[PDB]
Tab-separated table of C-alpha atoms in Angstrom:
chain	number	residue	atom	x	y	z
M	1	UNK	CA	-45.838	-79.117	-131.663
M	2	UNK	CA	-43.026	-79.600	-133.779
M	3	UNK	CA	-42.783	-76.097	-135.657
M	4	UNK	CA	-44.730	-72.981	-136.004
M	5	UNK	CA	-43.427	-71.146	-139.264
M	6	UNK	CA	-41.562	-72.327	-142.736
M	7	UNK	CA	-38.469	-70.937	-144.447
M	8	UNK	CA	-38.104	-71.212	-147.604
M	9	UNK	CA	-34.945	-71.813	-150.136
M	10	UNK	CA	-34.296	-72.289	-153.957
M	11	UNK	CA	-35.096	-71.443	-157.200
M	12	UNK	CA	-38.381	-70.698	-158.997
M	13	UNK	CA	-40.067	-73.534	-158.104
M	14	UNK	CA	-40.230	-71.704	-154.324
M	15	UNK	CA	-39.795	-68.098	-155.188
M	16	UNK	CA	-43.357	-66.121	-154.374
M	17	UNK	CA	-41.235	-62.845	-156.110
M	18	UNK	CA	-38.058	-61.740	-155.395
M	19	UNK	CA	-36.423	-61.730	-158.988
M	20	UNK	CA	-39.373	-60.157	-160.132
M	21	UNK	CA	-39.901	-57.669	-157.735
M	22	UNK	CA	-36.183	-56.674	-157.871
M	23	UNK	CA	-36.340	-55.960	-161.876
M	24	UNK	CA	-39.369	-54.585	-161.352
M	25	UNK	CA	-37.811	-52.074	-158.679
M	26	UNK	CA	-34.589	-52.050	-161.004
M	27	UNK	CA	-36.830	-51.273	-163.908
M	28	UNK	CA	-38.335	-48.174	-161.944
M	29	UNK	CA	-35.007	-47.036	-160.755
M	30	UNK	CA	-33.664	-46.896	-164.033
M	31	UNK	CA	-37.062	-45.083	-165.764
M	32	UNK	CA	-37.553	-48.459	-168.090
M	33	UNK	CA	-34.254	-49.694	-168.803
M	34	UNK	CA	-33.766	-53.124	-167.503
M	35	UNK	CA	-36.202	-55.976	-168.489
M	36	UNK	CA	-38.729	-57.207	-165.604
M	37	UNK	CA	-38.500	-60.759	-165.327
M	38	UNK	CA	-41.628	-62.998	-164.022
M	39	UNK	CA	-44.039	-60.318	-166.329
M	40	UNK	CA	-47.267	-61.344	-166.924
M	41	UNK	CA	-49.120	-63.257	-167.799
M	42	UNK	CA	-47.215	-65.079	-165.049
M	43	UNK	CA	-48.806	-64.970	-162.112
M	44	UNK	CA	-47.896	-61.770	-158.964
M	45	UNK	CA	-44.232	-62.906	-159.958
M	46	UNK	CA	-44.134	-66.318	-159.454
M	47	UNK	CA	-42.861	-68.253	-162.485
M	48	UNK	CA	-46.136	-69.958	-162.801
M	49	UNK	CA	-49.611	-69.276	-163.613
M	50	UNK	CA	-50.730	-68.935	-159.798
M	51	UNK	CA	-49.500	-69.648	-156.565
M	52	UNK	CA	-45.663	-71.902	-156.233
M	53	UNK	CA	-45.733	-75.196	-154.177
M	54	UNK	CA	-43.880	-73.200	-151.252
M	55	UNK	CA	-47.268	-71.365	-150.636
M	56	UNK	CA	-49.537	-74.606	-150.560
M	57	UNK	CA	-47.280	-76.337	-148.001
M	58	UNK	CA	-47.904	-73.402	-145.907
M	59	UNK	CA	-51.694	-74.086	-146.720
M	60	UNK	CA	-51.599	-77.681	-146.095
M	61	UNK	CA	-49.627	-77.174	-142.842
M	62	UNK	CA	-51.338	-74.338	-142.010
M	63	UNK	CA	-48.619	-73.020	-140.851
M	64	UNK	CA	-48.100	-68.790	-142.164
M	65	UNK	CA	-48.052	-68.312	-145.434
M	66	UNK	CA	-44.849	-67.412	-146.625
M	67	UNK	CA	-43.331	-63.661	-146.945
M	68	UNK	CA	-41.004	-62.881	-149.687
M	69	UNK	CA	-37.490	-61.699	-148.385
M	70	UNK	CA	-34.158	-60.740	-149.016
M	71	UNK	CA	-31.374	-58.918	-147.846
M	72	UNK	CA	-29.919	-55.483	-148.620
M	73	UNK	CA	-29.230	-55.214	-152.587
M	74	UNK	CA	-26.552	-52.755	-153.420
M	75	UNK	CA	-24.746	-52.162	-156.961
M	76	UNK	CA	-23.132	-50.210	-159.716
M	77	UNK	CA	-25.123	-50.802	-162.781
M	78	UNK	CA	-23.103	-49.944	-165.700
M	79	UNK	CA	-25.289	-49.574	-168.978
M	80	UNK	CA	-24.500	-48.425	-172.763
M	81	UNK	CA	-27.328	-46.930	-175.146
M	82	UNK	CA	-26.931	-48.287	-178.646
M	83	UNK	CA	-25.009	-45.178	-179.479
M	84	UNK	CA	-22.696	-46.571	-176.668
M	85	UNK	CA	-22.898	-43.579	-175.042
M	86	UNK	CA	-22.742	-45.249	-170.869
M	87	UNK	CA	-24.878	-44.749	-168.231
M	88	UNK	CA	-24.210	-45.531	-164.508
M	89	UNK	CA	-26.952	-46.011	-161.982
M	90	UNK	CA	-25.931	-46.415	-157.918
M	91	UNK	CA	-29.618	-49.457	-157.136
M	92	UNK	CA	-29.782	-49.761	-153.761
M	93	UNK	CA	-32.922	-51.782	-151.882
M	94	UNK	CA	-32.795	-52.275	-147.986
M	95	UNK	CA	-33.366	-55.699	-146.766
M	96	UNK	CA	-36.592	-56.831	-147.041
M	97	UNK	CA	-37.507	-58.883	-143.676
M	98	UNK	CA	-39.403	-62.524	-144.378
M	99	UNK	CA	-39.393	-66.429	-144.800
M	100	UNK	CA	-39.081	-66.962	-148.252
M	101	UNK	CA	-35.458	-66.447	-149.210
M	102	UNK	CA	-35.889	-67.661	-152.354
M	103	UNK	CA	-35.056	-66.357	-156.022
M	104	UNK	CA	-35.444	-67.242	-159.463
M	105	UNK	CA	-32.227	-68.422	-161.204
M	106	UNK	CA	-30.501	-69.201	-158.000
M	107	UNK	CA	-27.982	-71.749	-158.013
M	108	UNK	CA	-26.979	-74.005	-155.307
M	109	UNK	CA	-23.787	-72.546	-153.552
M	110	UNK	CA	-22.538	-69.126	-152.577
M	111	UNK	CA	-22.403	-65.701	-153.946
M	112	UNK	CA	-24.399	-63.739	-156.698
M	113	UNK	CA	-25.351	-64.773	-160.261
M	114	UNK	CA	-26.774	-62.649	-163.248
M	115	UNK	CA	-29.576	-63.249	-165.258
M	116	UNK	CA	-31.531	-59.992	-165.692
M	117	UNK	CA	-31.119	-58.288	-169.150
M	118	UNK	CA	-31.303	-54.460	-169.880
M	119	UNK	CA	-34.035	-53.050	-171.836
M	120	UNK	CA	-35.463	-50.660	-174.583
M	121	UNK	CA	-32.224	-50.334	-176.636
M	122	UNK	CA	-30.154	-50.903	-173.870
M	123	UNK	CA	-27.572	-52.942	-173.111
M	124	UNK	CA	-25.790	-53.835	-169.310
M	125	UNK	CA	-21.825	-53.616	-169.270
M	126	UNK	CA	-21.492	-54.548	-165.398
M	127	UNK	CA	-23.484	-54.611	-161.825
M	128	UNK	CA	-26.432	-56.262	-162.675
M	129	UNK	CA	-25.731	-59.517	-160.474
M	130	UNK	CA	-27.769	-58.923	-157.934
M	131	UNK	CA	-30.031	-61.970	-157.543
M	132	UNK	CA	-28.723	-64.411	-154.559
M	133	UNK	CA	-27.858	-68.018	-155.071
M	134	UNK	CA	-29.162	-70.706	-152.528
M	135	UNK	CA	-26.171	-70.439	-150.371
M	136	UNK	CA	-26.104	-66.743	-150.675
M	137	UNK	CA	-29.898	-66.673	-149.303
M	138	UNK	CA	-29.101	-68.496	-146.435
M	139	UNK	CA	-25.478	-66.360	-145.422
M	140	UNK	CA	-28.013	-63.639	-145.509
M	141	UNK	CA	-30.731	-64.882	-143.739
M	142	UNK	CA	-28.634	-65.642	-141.158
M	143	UNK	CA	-27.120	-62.238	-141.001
M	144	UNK	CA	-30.660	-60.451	-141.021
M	145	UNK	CA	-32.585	-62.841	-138.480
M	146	UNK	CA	-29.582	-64.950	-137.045
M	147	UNK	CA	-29.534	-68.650	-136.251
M	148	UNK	CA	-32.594	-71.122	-136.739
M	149	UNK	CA	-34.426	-71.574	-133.250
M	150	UNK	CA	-35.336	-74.986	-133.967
M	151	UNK	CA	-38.889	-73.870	-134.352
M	152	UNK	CA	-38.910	-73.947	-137.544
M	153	UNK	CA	-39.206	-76.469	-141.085
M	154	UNK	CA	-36.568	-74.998	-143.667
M	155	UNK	CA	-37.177	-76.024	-147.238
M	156	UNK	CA	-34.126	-76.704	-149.549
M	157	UNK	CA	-35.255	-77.436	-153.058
M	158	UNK	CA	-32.191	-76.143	-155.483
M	159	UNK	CA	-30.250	-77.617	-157.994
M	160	UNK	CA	-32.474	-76.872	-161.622
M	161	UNK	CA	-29.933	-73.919	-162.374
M	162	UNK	CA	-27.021	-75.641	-161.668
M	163	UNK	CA	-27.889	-77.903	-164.601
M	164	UNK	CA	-29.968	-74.881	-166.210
M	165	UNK	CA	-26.202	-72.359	-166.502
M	166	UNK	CA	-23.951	-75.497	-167.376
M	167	UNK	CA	-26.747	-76.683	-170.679
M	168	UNK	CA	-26.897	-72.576	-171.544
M	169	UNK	CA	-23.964	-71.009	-169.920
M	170	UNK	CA	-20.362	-71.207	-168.749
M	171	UNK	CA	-20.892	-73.123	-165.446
M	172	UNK	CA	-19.505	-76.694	-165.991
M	173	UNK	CA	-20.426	-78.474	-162.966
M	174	UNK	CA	-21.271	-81.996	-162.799
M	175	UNK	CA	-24.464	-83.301	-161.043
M	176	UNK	CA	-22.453	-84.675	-158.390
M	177	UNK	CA	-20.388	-81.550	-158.299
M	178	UNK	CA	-23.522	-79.385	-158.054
M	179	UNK	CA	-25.333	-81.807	-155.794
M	180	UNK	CA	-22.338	-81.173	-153.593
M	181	UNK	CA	-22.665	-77.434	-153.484
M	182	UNK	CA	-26.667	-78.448	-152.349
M	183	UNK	CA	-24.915	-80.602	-149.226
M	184	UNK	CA	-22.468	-77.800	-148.442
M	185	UNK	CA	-25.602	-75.868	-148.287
M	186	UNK	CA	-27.916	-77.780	-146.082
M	187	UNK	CA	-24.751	-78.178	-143.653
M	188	UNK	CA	-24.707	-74.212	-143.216
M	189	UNK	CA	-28.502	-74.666	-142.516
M	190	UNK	CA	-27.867	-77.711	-139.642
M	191	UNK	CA	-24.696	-75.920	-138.653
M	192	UNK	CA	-27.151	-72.845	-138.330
M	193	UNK	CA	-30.041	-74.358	-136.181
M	194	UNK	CA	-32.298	-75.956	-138.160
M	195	UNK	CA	-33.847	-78.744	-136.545
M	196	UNK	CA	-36.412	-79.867	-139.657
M	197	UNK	CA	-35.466	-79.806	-142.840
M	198	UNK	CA	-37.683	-80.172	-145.930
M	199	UNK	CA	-34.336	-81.174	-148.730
M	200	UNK	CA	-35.882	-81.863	-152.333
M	201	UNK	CA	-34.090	-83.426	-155.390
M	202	UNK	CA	-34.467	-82.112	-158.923
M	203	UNK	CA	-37.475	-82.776	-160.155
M	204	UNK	CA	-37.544	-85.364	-163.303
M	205	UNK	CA	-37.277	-82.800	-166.201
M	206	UNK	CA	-36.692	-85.369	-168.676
M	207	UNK	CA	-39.544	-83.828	-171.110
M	208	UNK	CA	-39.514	-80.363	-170.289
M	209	UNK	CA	-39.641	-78.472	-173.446
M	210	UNK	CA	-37.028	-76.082	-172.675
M	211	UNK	CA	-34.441	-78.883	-172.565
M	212	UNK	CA	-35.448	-80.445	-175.569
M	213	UNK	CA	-32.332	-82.154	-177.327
M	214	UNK	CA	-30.469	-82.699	-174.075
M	215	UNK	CA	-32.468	-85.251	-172.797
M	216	UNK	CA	-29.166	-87.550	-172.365
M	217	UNK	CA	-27.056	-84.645	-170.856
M	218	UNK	CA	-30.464	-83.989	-168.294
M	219	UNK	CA	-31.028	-87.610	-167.137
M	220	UNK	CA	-27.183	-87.574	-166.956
M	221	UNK	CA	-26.973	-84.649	-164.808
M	222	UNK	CA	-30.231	-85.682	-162.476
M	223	UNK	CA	-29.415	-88.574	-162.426
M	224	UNK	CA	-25.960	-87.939	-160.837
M	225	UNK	CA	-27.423	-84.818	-159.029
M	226	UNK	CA	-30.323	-86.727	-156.844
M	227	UNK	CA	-28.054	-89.741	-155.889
M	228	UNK	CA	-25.449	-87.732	-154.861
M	229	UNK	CA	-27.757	-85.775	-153.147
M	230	UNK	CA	-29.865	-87.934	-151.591
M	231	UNK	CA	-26.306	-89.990	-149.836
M	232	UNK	CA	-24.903	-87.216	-148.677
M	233	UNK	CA	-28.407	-86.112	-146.818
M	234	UNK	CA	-27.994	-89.803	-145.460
M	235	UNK	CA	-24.827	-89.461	-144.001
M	236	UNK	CA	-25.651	-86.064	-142.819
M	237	UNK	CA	-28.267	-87.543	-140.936
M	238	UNK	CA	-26.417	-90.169	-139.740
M	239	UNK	CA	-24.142	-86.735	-138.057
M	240	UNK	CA	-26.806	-85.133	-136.651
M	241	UNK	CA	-29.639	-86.939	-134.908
M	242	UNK	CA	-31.403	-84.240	-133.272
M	243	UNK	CA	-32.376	-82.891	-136.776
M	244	UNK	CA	-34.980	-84.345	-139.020
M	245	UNK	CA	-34.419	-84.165	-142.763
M	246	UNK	CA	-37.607	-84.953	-144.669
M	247	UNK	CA	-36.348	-85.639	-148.301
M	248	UNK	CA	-38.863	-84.887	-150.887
M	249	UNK	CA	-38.509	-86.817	-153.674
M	250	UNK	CA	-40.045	-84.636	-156.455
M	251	UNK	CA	-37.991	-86.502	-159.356
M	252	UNK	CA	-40.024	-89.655	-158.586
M	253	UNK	CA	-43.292	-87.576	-157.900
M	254	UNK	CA	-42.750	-85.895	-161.320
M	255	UNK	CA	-41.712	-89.722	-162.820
M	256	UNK	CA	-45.193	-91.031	-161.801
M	257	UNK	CA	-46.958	-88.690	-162.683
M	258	UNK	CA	-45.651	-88.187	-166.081
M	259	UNK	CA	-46.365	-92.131	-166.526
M	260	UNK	CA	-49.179	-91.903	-165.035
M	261	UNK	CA	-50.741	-89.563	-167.650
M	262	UNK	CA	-49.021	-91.306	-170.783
M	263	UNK	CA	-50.095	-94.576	-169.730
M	264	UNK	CA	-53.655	-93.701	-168.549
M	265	UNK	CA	-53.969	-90.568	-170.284
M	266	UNK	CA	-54.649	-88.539	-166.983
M	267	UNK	CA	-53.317	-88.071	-163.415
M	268	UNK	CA	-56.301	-87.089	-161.523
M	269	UNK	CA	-56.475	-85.879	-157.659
M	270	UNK	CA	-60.194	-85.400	-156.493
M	271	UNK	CA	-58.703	-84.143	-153.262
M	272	UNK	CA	-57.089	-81.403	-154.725
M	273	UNK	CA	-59.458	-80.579	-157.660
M	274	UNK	CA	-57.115	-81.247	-160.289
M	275	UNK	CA	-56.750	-83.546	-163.856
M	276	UNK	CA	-53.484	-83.072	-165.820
M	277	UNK	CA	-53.577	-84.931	-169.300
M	278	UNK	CA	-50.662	-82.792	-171.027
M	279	UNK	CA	-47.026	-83.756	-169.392
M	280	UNK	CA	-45.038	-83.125	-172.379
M	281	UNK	CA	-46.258	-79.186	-173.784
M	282	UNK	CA	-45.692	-76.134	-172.790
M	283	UNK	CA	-49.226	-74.186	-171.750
M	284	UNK	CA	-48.032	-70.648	-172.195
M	285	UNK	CA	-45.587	-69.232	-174.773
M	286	UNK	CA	-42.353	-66.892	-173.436
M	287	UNK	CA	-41.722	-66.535	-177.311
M	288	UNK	CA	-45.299	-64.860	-178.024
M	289	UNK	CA	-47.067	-64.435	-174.701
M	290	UNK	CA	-49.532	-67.134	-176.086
M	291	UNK	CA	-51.553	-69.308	-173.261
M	292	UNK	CA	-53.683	-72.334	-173.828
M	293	UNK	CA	-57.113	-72.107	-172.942
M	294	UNK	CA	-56.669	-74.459	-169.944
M	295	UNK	CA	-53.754	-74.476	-168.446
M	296	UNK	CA	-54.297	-76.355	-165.608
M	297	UNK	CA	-54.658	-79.945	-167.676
M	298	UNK	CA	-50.493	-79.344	-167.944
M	299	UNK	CA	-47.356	-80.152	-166.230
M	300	UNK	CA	-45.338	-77.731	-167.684
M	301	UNK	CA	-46.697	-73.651	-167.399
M	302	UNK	CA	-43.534	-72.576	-169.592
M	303	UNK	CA	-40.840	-75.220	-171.224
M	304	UNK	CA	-39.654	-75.650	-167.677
M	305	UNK	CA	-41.382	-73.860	-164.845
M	306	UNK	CA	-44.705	-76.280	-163.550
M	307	UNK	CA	-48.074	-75.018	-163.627
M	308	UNK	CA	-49.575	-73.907	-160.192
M	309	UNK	CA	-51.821	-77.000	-160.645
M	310	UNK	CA	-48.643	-79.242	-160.206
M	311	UNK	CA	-47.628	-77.018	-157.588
M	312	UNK	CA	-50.208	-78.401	-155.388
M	313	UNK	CA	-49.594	-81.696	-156.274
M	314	UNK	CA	-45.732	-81.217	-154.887
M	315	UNK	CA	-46.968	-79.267	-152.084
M	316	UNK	CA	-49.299	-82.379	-151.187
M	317	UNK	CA	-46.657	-84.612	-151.781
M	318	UNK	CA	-44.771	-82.643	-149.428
M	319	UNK	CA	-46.740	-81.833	-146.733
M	320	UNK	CA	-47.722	-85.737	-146.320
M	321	UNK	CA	-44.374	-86.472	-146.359
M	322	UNK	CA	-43.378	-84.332	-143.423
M	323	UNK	CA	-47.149	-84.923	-141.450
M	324	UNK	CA	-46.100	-89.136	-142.112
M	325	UNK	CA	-42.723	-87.955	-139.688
M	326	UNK	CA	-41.121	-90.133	-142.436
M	327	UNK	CA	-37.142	-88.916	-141.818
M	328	UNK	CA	-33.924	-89.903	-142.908
């Protein structure tokens, strides 16, 4: 056989709960004052409205379905009440052993990011970057469970945030700049044992509400991003043929289907159960809380995040891609 479990890396397009489940432990900790990210009515924590294309590939493969994990969390979180009076908490989580390293908001490269908020009057001076970027999740791994054994597919999918903190924050990386933090990345994962690699692009975000008036900066970014990307996987081939890197092209999958349903007014899959005929809406609100009555006819869950009906589309997409043995 060629593998008997997955790992998984990214963003929240893999994530089956980690930033959630760390506000939500954060939000304990602190009796209510930090903001849980991933609430409902998204669904157990994934930033979708069911299961994340991550737990379908395991399905399709049936290989195990993946379990959320992370390593030890450890910070001071400095807070101030609206009378400014502070307030310092010592969060601590042990490592949490499993296969899906991934988090929401991650970015590709190394370190820590923030992007939880305080809550209920409160706002957060310090200590509150504790989510892992993609490079972060795999130093980690590593440390908790050591090198690959070759036994194993690892899934790369990362890059979304990279454009996501450079639109709405003060990263200012180019998509050849962050698409060469993602090839840094996957050479820790080669240089770590892997010997099958699942490497995805950015999917094609071009109408995703949530980047609506940036459409130029977007298909500039991606644009840059998945070539980038998808040469240096090339040459890293090219370096190391006893691995096979599978690269899932999501930004075409998400291109046809998006033309698909403008130009034929569905994308249908009787295989998988599923008709989209929305690629341009949002089917739930973060503003409001507000969900369409059928979701599942959508693309887009929030203005970014896909529903779990296009989750199984990728996953599909996917898991034919690495059962075809179709490698780099």
């Amino acid at each position: 056989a060629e593998f008997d479990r997955i790992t998984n890396f990214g963003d929240a397009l893999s994530d089956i709960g980690n930033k959630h489940m760390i506000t939500v432990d954060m939000n304990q900790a602190t009796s209510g004052k930090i903001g849980i990210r991933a609430d409902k009515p998204n669904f157990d924590g994934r930033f979708s409205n069911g299961p994340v294309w991550t737990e379908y590939l395991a399905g399709f493969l049936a290989k195990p379905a993946p379990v959320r994990g992370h390593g030890e969390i450890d910070s001071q979180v400095v807070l101030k009440d609206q009378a400014g009076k502070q307030i310092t908490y010592h969060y601590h989580h042990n490592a949490l052993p499993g296969t899906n390293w991934a988090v929401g908001g991650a970015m590709s490269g190394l370190g820590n990011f923030l992007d939880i908020d305080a809550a209920n009057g409160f706002t957060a001076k310090s200590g509150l970057d504790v989510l892992t970027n993609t490079g972060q999740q795999i130093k980690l791994r590593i440390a908790n469970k050591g090198q690959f054994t070759g036994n194993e597919l690892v899934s790369y999918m990362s890059g979304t945030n990279n454009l996501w903190f450079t639109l709405f924050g003060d990263l200012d990386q180019t998509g050849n700049k962050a698409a060469g933090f993602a090839l840094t990345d996957i050479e820790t994962l080669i240089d770590a044992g892997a010997k099958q690699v699942l490497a995805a692009n950015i999917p094609d975000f071009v109408d995703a509400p949530w980047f609506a008036g940036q459409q130029k900066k977007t298909t500039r970014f991606i644009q840059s991003h998945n070539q980038a990307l998808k040469a240096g996987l090339d040459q890293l081939a090219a370096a190391h043929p006893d691995v096979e890197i599978y690269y899932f092209d999501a930004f075409d999958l998400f291109n046809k289907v998006s033309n698909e349903v403008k130009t034929k007014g569905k994308y249908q899959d009787k295989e998988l159960a599923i008709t989209l005929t929305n690629v341009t809406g949002e089917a739930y609100s973060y503003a409001t809380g507000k969900v369409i009555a059928q979701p599942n006819r959508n693309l887009f869950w929030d203005g970014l995040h896909p529903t779990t009906a296009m989750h199984k589309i990728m996953a599909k997409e996917a898991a034919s891609l690495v059962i075809s043995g179709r490698t780099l």
